[PDB]
């Protein structure tokens, strides 16, 4: 089975690959996880830094003037107890939280809160990254990535394709013999200050309606539903779709987004879209959903 994994940067592609390794390949040993410690620290550090810099641009004051010195020390110091102390105090400040709650106005790693709220565990001298920690890490994937695994008597060749440029010849060998395509969308991108969600729709449009995928299973992964459910409570879908007239419940908003993407299909009577709502970092959910995707390939 030749599987193509597509979607805008940060939609979750590499995380799903990690899930395949965890679910059908032997997972991440404790020593493999140890290798991600640097990335976890790096992600944590760049996250808190991004929030502080944003405070300057957005003109947000600290809740406690004392933090000013910690902010200053943060930049100088960048996981020593010294740096951890500076991060814990900054993360705790109401002013910093105020800026964090306005992340939709700048660039901030999805996992920012995940790591910052777990600093104590992360900062420990003998800290050993857990699988969830690894899944949460953000590292830009440049170039096509491939992973192999057997499941239900099928040999899967999964290709994680990013947004790099290449010769038409390489793309041809890439898109040929494709049994199925999984397009990933970051649901939580809907309110990010054209629209990021619309960029994504444009991408899906070209995949869904292309004649050469007429016999290829088109699968839509509406990802980051967990971040989406949290954001929808305070940030209205209208920010993304100004004509939307429904309620701001997770269920309605999600159904709507799904409908917007499926509507792009110009051959509803001929081609079927297989939509799933996922939490790429939740291996139990990815397993369930992938099992379902595998069945559709069998059938």
């Amino acid at each position: 089975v030749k599987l193509l994994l597509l979607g805008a940067g940060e939609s979750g592609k590499s995380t799903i690959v990690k899930q395949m390794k965890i679910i059908h390949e032997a997972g991440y040993s404790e020593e493999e996880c140890k290798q991600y410690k640097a990335v976890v620290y790096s992600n944590t550090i760049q996250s808190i830094i991004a929030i502080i810099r944003a405070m300057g641009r957005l003109k947000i004051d600290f809740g406690d003037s004392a933090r000013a010195d910690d902010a200053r020390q943060l930049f100088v110091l960048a996981m020593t107890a010294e740096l951890a102390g500076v991060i814990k105090r900054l993360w705790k400040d109401s002013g910093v939280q105020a800026c964090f709650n306005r992340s939709r106005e700048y660039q901030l790693n999805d996992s920012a809160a995940y790591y910052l709220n777990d600093l104590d565990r992360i900062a420990q001298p003998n800290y050993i990254p857990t699988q969830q920690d690894v899944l949460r890490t953000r590292v830009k994937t440049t170039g096509i990535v491939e992973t192999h695994f057997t499941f239900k008597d099928l040999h899967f060749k999964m290709f994680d394709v990013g947004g790099q440029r290449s010769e038409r010849k390489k793309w041809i060998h890439c898109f040929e013999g494709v049994t199925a395509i999984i397009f990933c969308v970051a649901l939580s991108d809907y309110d990010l200050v054209m629209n990021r969600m619309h960029e994504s729709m444009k991408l899906f449009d070209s995949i869904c309606n292309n004649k050469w995928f007429t016999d290829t299973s088109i699968i839509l992964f509406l990802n980051k539903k967990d971040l989406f459910e949290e954001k929808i409570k305070k940030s209205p879908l209208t920010i993304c779709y100004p004509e939307y007239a429904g309620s701001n419940t997770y269920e309605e908003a999600a159904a709507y987004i799904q409908c917007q993407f499926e509507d792009l299909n110009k051959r509803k009577d001929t081609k079927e879209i297989y939509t799933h709502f996922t939490c790429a970092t939740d291996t139990k959910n990815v397993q369930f959903v992938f099992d379902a995707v595998t069945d559709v390939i069998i059938k």
């Binding site: 597509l6 290449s166 010769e167 793309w171």
Partner: peptide
């Protein structure tokens, strides 16, 4: 001579 996969498919 190099392009993204999107522009590659968007070709007429």
């Amino acid at each position: 001579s190099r392009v993204t996969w999107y522009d590659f498919l968007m070709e007429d």
